[PDB]
Paper text:
The [name] proteins consist of an N-terminal intrinsic disorder region (IDR), a middle long coiled-coil region and a C-terminal Postsynaptic density-95/Discs large/Zona occludens-1 (PDZ)-binding motif (PBM).
In the crystal, each asymmetric unit contains two [name]_RBD molecules and two Rab6BQ72L molecules, which form two essentially identical complexes with a binding ratio of 1:1 between [name]_RBD and Rab6BQ72L. In the complex structure, Rab6BQ72L adopts the typical active GTPase conformation with a bound GTP molecule and [name]_RBD consists of two α-helices (αN and αC) to interact with the switch Ⅰ, switch Ⅱ, and interswitch regions of Rab6BQ72L. The two helices in [name]_RBD fold as a helical hairpin through interhelical hydrophobic interactions, which resembles the coiled-coil conformation and explains the monomer instead of dimer formation of this predicted coiled-coil region. The binding of [name]_RBD to Rab6BQ72L involves both polar and hydrophobic interactions. Specifically, four pairs of charged residues (E857ELKS1-R84Rab6B, E869ELKS1-K13Rab6B, D871ELKS1-R63Rab6B, and K905ELKS1-D49Rab6B) form salt bridges to stabilize the interaction between [name] and [name]. Among these charged residues, D871ELKS1 and K13Rab6B are further involved in the hydrogen bond network connected by S868ELKS1 and Q65Rab6B, which further strengthens the binding of [name]_RBD to Rab6BQ72L. In addition to the polar interactions, several hydrophobic residues in [name]_RBD, including L864, I867, T908, and M912, pack with the hydrophobic pocket formed by the switch II and interswitch regions of [name]. Compared to the other Rab6 effectors, [name] occupies a larger surface on Rab6, encompassing not only the switch regions but also the interswitch region. The extended part of [name]_RBD interacts with a region outside the canonical effector binding site, specifically, the residues L11 and K13 in the β1-strand of Rab6BQ72L, which are strictly conserved in Rab6 family members but not in other Rab members.
Author numbering:
A (entry chain A): 8 to 175
B (entry chain C): 849 to 919
Amino acid sequence: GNPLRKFKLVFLGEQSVGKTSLITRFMYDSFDNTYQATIGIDFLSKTMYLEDRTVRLQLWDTAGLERFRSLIPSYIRDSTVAVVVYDITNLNSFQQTSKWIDDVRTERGSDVIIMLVGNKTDLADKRQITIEEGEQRAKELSVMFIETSAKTGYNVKQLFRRVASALP
Amino acid sequence: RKHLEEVLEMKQEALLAAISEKDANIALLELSSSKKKTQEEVAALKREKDRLVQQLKQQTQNRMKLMADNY
Ligand SMILES: Nc1nc2c(ncn2[C@@H]2O[C@H](COP(=O)(O)OP(=O)(O)OP(=O)(O)O)[C@@H](O)[C@H]2O)c(=O)[nH]1
Ligand SMILES: [Mg+2]
């Protein structure tokens, strides 16, 4: 009965941080233990219902493997939302989110919503970045922030709900 | 090479919009899919969406093959 709008979300981050696993958990309420790297870019979608609005979330799931890197600016430009993912056990993946976010702004400027995601919170014994450092980095780059575990499902639904509530 | 890149970019842009609009149309019909006729249209649009997504993947492989040449 409500108006329906589409919004495209691009998932960005170093290889193996869990971009696809977050999507698989949201789309299929499942988790795959065996790593299957994304070859190029994949498309998935889901409808979300909100008070007085319906949104069709369209997801560009991009590869972290370096050979596909030059294909990614096209999908950033195509998207109004960027989900930049790192791995809380992997300091380099966190540092690189500054580069990912800078590339988003190269393609979109301020005309974009950015969610920084620290994934794999279930690997608590191997954590290399505190939740505080992630929260402060996001505030410094003026982006949203959340920590998740695609493996346990922790905060995965909240990630997409918070993004959907931020849309126009 | 810069010229080939402009050509491939424009073709991909057409394809991304077609995928997104095909998917948007699926989402619209799914809202009120309370009929045998509606799910049949939904099934057909889903076939068309998969076909477009498959074209994009193949265009992507072609794009990387043509970038790996000498200019
Ligand atoms: N413990 C734990 N492992 C995870 C989690 N998320 C992903 N993994 C594992 O990490 C590996 C990489 O996951 P992917 O979802 O394929 O990562 P990706 O970012 O999509 O990787 P690329 O597409 O190659 O860029 C897989 O083995 C997953 O099972 C998580 O939340 N917790
Ligand atoms: Mg992936």
